[PDB]
Ligand binder design. Structure first.
Ligand code: GNP
Ligand code: MG
Ligand code: ZN
Ligand code: ZN
Ligand code: ZN
Lengths: 168, 134
């Protein structure tokens, strides 16, 4: 059974944990609980193959910018998350994307751009802007809501397919 | 800084902030439940980096601040009927229903231990831990 080491990165409060827990436990927490370090394992079927997802939820607080480099190295695929509500967190995806590429010494890095908090009505980031940023990186883009579970499966399923394709 | 790193069952881990007064149980209940682990099916250990033994058991209500800067491990109690699922391709000739979404299930997957039957697009909704009293 193939294991897949996934890492969820992004600004604090964009929904990395809400997304992951919606994946692992089918529940939705609407509370504030800034993460420091959280690792999850769960089995998932993808294109017929049962595989093992090992997900690391990272801290978006910049108070933890030092443990970042080490976990980015071991990780095989990355979910770069931003909230459609926060423009800063959208522009900061670049900061995270360059930080990952330094430790992986390549640009064929398995990555998926994720737009969370799609339920809310105050959408400051347009689909087209995000598709443009994804085409700019040559990676997929996927809109999600941890509240309603929209595209939560799709986001992780697509990261795994990126790993398999890059694995060749 | 006032944190504890806790290794968890099935090779998972967490770092928790220790608010003053909390027990290890109060610090760890969510991280265990959010992984589908019942805290009642678990013990918390202090890892001993200098011993014949790898770890010594602690009381769950032990005050957590008493262990800031140690490395803790949570393990399943002896022989608890929890395990990891064992999935298999299965095709259902007879009408079957998905245990997750109750729609018809034609071409899916089943655990070979507990029997959960599901659609691929429902697999993330299968509970993390396989329960077995067989
Ligand atoms: N309405 C709505 N709220 C969401 C959504 N996703 C996350 N939230 C809310 O956003 C807040 C923080 O989410 P959280 O998952 O903790 O984000 P994070 O990116 O893991 N934060 P941190 O980096 O500090 O650990 C919580 O109030 C949570 O309920 C979503 O899709 N919709
Ligand atoms: Mg978090
Ligand atoms: Zn910046
Ligand atoms: Zn099972
Ligand atoms: Zn189903």
């Amino acid at each position: 059974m193939t294991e897949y080491k996934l890492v969820v990165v992004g600004a604090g409060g964009v929904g990395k944990s809400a997304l992951t827990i919606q994946l692992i436990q089918n529940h939705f927490v609407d509370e504030y609980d800034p993460t420091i370090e959280d690792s999850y394992r769960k089995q998932v079927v993808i294109d017929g193959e049962t595989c093992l997802l090992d997900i690391l939820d990272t801290a978006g607080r910049e108070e933890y910018s030092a443990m970042r480099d080490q976990y980015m190295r071991t990780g095989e695929g990355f979910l770069c998350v931003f909230a459609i509500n926060n423009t800063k967190s959208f522009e900061d995806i670049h900061h995270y994307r360059e930080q990952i590429k330094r430790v992986k010494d390549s640009e064929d890095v398995p990555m998926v751009l994720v737009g969370n908090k799609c339920d809310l009505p105050s959408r400051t980031v347009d689909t087209k802007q995000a598709q443009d940023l994804a085409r700019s990186y040559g990676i997929p883009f996927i809109e999600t809501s941890a509240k309603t579970r929209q595209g939560v499966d799709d986001a992780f399923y697509t990261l795994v397919r990126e790993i398999r394709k890059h694995k060749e | 800084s006032n944190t504890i790193r806790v290794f968890l069952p099935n090779k998972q881990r967490t770092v928790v902030n220790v608010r003053n007064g909390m027990s290890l149980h109060d610090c760890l209940m969510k991280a265990l439940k959010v992984r589908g682990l019942q805290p009642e099916c678990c013990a918390v250990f202090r890892l001993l980096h200098e011993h014949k033994g790898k770890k010594a058991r602690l009381d769950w209500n032990t005050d957590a601040a008493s262990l800031i800067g140690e490395e803790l491990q949570v393990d399943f109690l002896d022989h608890v009927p929890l395990t990891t699922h064992n999935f298999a391709r299965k095709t259902f000739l007879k009408l079957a229903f998905c245990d997750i979404c109750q729609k018809f299930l034609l071409n899916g997957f089943r655990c070979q231990t507990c029997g959960y039957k599901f659609h691929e697009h429902c697999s993330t909704k299968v509970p993390t831990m396989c329960v077995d009293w067989s």
